[PDB]
Amino acid sequence: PTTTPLK
Ligand SMILES: *[C@H]1O[C@H](CO)[C@H](O)[C@H](O)[C@H]1NC(C)=O
């Protein structure tokens, strides 16, 4: 249910 500084 989250994310991260992807490309
Ligand atoms: C966001 O960065 C995190 C660092 O722990 C992970 O590498 C995660 O897979 C990244 N999200 C995406 C969509 O690449």
**Can you give the three-state secondary structure of 1-7, one letter per residue?**
CCCCCCC
Read off the tokens for 2.
């989250």
State in Å: Cα 1 to ligand 1 middle. Answer: 13
State in Å: Cα 7 to ligand 1 middle. Answer: 9
Q: How many CB atoms lie within 10 A of CB 7?
A: 2
Q: How many CB atoms lie within 10 A of CB 1?
A: 2
**Residues of the chain immediately before an interruption (C to N > 2.5 Å):** none
Distance, CA of 3 to chain centre: 3
Measured distance CA(4)–CA(6) in Å, rounded = 6
Q: Whose CA is nearest to atom 5 of ligand 1?
A: 4
